[PDB]
Specification:
Elements: H1 2-12, H2 20-34, H3 43-62, E1 69-77, E2 82-88, E3 94-101, H4 102-106, H5 113-121, E4 129-134, E5 138-143, H6 151-157, H7 162-181, E6 184-185, E7 194-196, E8 202-204, E9 211-212, H8 231-236, H9 245-260, H10 270-278, H11 280-283, H12 294-303, H13 316-320, E10 382-383
Antiparallel strand pairs: 1-2, 2-3, 3-5, 4-5, 4-10, 6-9, 7-8
The structure holds the ligand O=C(Cc1ccc(-c2n[nH]c(=O)c3ccccc23)cc1)N1CCc2ccccc21.
């Protein structure tokens, strides 16, 4: 009973590898991976499935499921799956729910490690995870809805003045400081990941790229669209190592797209984008027509240089000290409680005006032998 108290404690700890959610995930996966007629020929499998069939159904009904949510509309669709604006039926609260195809996911081990670190850190600069669940086909992630839309949408609807770019860059800078302080490297900082909350304040979202830094403060191994990716990250794709400074390159790309209107290494092809990024010493140029302050040009260039000499290599203090961030509207300690330059007008809690309309799927193939397709997702379920 003393050893049983110690064992009953690990299972109660929600941050434990084997806990109630993990144990339930294990039993659900075991039932799913064995419920195939070819496998059912084995008496051990058929009998286990018979005993636990009814109870696994009862348990699946009590646990959080997709049916507990009302699908308002799709606000993003991709290769992975979609993002739905949903409302929890019982609490009546609106959330953003990403659906990941388990099948597509498997074609890419413990990938939610960084999601858990970020979820626990609970930074006001990072889009919050409330719950995560799963069914045979999908992985579900219930996130805080960011009704202000992303910075792709803001950029395509506004001509961004230096007062505005000075604010979003500072918020991205504090969000990246937060992520690095968790022992993480975002890896794919771009305006699709820059989401705006109910008041127009920025938060960084991780769409599966965040990685835990090793003892040396480095990562490895994905890119997708490269406009915001540093040369070191491109060159690593390979098993190459890079640090947190790869995220500061994306801040420079961001400041450029805000003030200029186009990405600094844009091209009609992906190859050309990749090339212009690698030859960034010759290809970086500001248009004559685009009027940009000396400090703005300076800051973009301090970030868009080789990792060795890039701004942020010494720390965040030199980025904050940069004269571009001299202003009469905010401080580095109070920026999030100051007036945001673009305040959203939201008539209802399901107002999705800042999101482009989408409106309107492959699965695992039935196995002959046990293959354990559900095994990699044991522990994904998150409840707090
Ligand atoms: O993608 C996500 C987590 C996430 C984070 C924010 C949002 C999100 N949140 N809020 C909004 O309003 C919104 C509007 C459009 C689009 C998205 C949103 C949705 C999912 N992860 C995290 C772990 C992981 C592994 C593998 C693959 C993916 C992901």
């Amino acid at each position: 009973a003393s050893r049983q108290r110690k064992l009953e404690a690990l299972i109660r700890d929600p941050r434990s590898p084997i806990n109630v959610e993990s144990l339930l995930d294990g039993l659900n996966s075991l039932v799913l991976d064995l419920d195939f007629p070819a496998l059912r020929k084995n008496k051990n499998i058929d009998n286990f499935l018979n005993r636990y069939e009814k109870i696994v159904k009862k348990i699946r009904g009590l646990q959080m499921k997709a049916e507990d949510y009302d699908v308002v509309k799709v606000i993003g669709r991709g290769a992975f799956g979609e993002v739905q604006l949903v409302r929890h039926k019982a609490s009546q609260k609106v959330y953003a729910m990403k659906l990941l195809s388990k099948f597509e996911m498997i074609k890419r081990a413990f990938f939610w490690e960084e999601r858990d670190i970020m979820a626990f850190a609970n930074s006001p600069w990072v889009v919050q995870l409330f719950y995560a669940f799963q069914d045979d086909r999908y992985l579900y992630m219930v996130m805080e809805y960011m009704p202000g839309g992303d910075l792709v949408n803001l950029m395509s609807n506004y001509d961004v003045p230096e007062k505005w770019a000075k604010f979003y860059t500072a918020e991205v800078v504090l969000a990246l400081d937060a992520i690095h302080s968790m022992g993480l490297i975002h890896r794919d900082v771009k305006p699709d990941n820059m989401l705006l909350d109910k008041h127009g304040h920025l938060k960084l979202a991780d769409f599966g790229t965040c990685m835990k830094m090793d003892e040396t403060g480095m990562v490895h191994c994905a890119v997708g669209t490269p406009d915001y990716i540093s040369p070191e990250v491109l060159k690593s794709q390979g098993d190459g190592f890079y640090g947190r400074e790869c995220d500061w390159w994306s801040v420079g790309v961001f400041l450029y797209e805000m003030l200029v209107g186009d990405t600094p290494f844009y091209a009609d092809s992906l190859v050309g984008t990749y090339s212009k990024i690698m030859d960034h010493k010759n290809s970086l140029c500001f248009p004559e027509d685009a009027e940009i302050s000396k400090h703005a040009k300076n800051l973009i260039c301090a970030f868009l240089t080789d990792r060795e000499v890039r701004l942020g290599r010494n720390g965040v203090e030199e980025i904050r000290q940069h004269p571009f961030f001299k202003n009469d509207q905010w401080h580095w300690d109070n920026i999030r409680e100051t007036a945001a330059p673009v305040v959203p007008e939201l008539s209802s809690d399901i107002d999705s005006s800042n999101f482009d309309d989408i409106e309107d799927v492959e699965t695992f193939p039935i196995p002959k032998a046990f293959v354990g397709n559900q095994l990699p997702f044991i522990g994904f379920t998150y409840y707090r």
